[PDB]
Design a binder for this molecule. Structure first.
Ligand SMILES: NC(=O)C1=CN([C@@H]2O[C@H](COP(=O)(O)OP(=O)(O)OC[C@H]3O[C@@H](n4cnc5c(N)ncnc54)[C@H](OP(=O)(O)O)[C@@H]3O)[C@@H](O)[C@H]2O)C=CC1
Ligand SMILES: NC(=O)C1=CN([C@@H]2O[C@H](COP(=O)(O)OP(=O)(O)OC[C@H]3O[C@@H](n4cnc5c(N)ncnc54)[C@H](OP(=O)(O)O)[C@@H]3O)[C@@H](O)[C@H]2O)C=CC1
Ligand SMILES: OC[C@H]1O[C@H](O[C@H]2[C@H](O)[C@@H](O)[C@@H](O[C@H]3[C@H](O)[C@@H](O)[C@H](O)O[C@@H]3CO)O[C@@H]2CO)[C@H](O)[C@@H](O)[C@@H]1O
Ligand SMILES: OC[C@H]1O[C@H](O[C@H]2[C@H](O)[C@@H](O)[C@@H](O[C@H]3[C@H](O)[C@@H](O)[C@H](O)O[C@@H]3CO)O[C@@H]2CO)[C@H](O)[C@@H](O)[C@@H]1O
Lengths: 335, 335
């Protein structure tokens, strides 16, 4: 049994990363396309053998309610458009996969969660790293007690962003700067590595406003998290340096991945008992993208809850709001 | 020619690490021993061929003023005793090498500086990493513009401390916890890699007071620094995990060392326009310990000021005070 996906927003992540990976899916198939660009419907429709009956514009999208080949809508638009397409998908009676960050604000996440709940449909956020072999290995090491209690997480995510005119540097479409786009991986990892939610937040923001990229959104915003167990996190989010990594440490040792949350190329190093050494993780049957896709399908087929549901996206937005507030007010913000 | 060192406080660092390294010095020699333990004066006096006339207790130390073979007193005691022994050394007409952290407080550092200035004698703090090959290479890459402007420094220093009865876990003798002893390397590195002084500080402290080690001083205190240029640092200081590293990053690339400030075994990786790769630093004429010792001797001989003088130690203590305050008050502290 395979559930049918409609892919909505045929941009870089949809066409270059996600759509090719239906190949290794065992419980998901590409069923429909939704796009604001008629040429893309034709190009990708022909490539993937999607009939015109299964190609929608953003104006005809609501008609997808009458397409029984579509079980799931995967929303892969700019951040500010996640909420309205998710709500429309839910009203069309479809389950929803929504890319990160979930939405601009906590309230927008709550609205999305309520719409899917009202429709009796499942909602999952695209945190692919939870299906990635090295990340799973680090989480399991922590959970198995290999490190002892988690004491620190140090994690940095950033890339040197380019074209000033792209939607990620436009507040109306992006909802914020590096933190919304790439810093969220630092936050999400801090949460899944500790298995906790933070109770206190510090942040420092640093942005050169004379740079043509950064008239509207932030470049650097680094933050600290305190958790109820006493665990701490130091996190970098940046649009002007390249980094992608984390190290989680306890009294018995530590494990790091660098790059940690990239599309490929992960490398893990651990210091457990002896000197630091590379560690190979248990391989996963499917790559992280196909695994993510199949996870939602499998949840729907067996009536289970996604491990990264709407609530996970919302928990991230709650901390993101506090991070921005902490930097603005120059104080420790309590959650 | 060579200047004579008196080594004061014959503990682990003095006897296991520093005193063997006079072998490779070119302008420094071991001339005297000062100790509160008669047996050690005998042991090390015999081992190193130091005559009984050049052996002092803490009671007779002031008599060293009459010993012309002694040019420099190297103070290697618990932190709270740095100030009184430094002042006595200066009043005994000797130049002073003082171990880190310089002293417990800003006021104590200022007092040591005034004492040496009054005596017309030089004061240097034992920041050996400034003479270590990998660290010098990292500073050079920054100053040569290899990375572009520094945007982030991410640095972690900690070790799993043992015996609860040792002076480092005793506030009266240590002056504070992990930040005083090991976290200061994170701070000092942030400062010499940016080449700036911070203008704002955040901090988070986390200590299990039911742990036998931590009745008096702090375990983890992580901090954030903002610099005038816009550069940022995220720093870990810990007594319950092992870490020793830093990475400095700009828009053109990054360089990291791990272990960074250890006695030996430094390894460097850099990302400069290509994928991350190991990098070997330019070699140094001698090891960081002998280089540190000769640096002070050479400064005295040529009249120059040490690159890590008393003001460097003071600058660290100023930020350390702000780190503890930021943690205590839960706010961004301005400097
Ligand atoms: N999990 C991951 O690893 C990744 C997640 N993402 C997430 O995916 C989403 C899209 O990112 P990416 O695919 O990189 O962005 P792109 O700009 O490459 O694609 C965005 C697409 O969204 C559609 N769209 C609808 N309205 C607009 C609008 N007003 N302005 C621009 N585009 C619009 C367009 O598709 P059409 O022409 O079909 O309308 C456009 O091509 C974001 O939420 C991002 O965070 C991105 C990359 C990786
Ligand atoms: N730069 C570096 O890499 C390092 C720097 N250090 C610094 O060196 C100093 C000493 O550290 P370490 O050598 O590890 O500590 P140790 O405890 O091993 O040596 C301390 C010595 O100081 C003397 N001393 C004087 N008064 C006291 C006292 N009241 N209680 C205890 N000892 C006393 C004793 O020597 P005696 O018996 O001769 O009186 C004792 O052996 C500290 O400031 C530390 O921060 C330490 C390690 C490495
Ligand atoms: O070392 C990890 C990788 O670093 C580089 O990847 C960059 C991308 O070039 C850049 O587009 C950006 O992609 C992220 C995207 O903006 C975000 O929406 C999404 O959720 O995550 C994407 C992937 O992280 O940032 C990454 C930095 O990780 C480099 O191009 C790549 O080869 C390296 O593997
Ligand atoms: O990976 C780096 C090293 O980690 C371990 O070294 C520990 C020491 O065992 C511990 O004593 C402590 O030494 C520091 C000391 O407390 C402080 O006063 C001084 O200024 O710095 C000393 C050296 O850093 O912390 C270090 C951690 O750096 C490990 O034992 C060693 O093999 C590793 O090389």
């Amino acid at each position: 049994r395979k559930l049918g996906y409609a892919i909505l927003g045929l941009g870089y992540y949809a066409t270059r990363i996600i759509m090719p990976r239906f190949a290794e899916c065992e419980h998901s198939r590409l069923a429909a396309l939704v796009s604001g660009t008629p040429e893309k419907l034709k190009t990708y429709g022909e490539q993937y053998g999607i009939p015109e009956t299964h190609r929608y514009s953003y104006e005809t999208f609501d008609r997808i309610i009458d397409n029984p080949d579509v079980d799931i809508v995967y929303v892969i638009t700019p951040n500010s458009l996640h909420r309205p397409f998710t709500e429309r998908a839910a009203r069309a009676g479809k389950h929803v996969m929504c890319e990160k960050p979930m939405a601009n604000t906590v309230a927008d996440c709550e609205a999305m969660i309520a719409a899917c709940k009202k429709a009796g449909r499942k909602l999952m956020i695209g945190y692919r790293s939870r299906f990635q072999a090295h990340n799973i290995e680090a989480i399991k090491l922590v959970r198995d007690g290999a490190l002892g209690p988690v004491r620190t997480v140090v994690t940095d995510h950033g890339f040197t962003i380019g074209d000033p005119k792209q939607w990620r540097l436009n507040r109306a479409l992006a909802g914020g700067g590096s933190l919304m786009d790439i810093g969220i991986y630092s936050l999400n990892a801090a949460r899944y590595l500790t298995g906790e939610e933070p109770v206190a937040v510090n942040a420092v923001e640093s942005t050169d406003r004379s740079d043509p990229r950064f008239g509207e959104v932030e470049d650097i915003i680094n933050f600290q998290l305190l958790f109820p167990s006493g665990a701490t996190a130091n996190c970098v989010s940046a649009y002007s340096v390249n980094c992608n990594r984390y190290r989680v440490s306890g009294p018995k040792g530590w494990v790091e991945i660098d790059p940690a949350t990239s599309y490929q190329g992960q490398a893990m190093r651990a210091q457990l008992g002896g000197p630091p050494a590379p560690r190979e993780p248990a391989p996963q049957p499917k790559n992280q993208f196909s695994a993510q896709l199949d996870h939602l399908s499998e949840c729907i087929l067996t009536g289970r809850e996604p491990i990264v549901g709407g609530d996970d996206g919302l928990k991230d937005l709650r901390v993101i709001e506090a991070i921005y507030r902490a930097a603005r007010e120059g104080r420790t913000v309590k959650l």
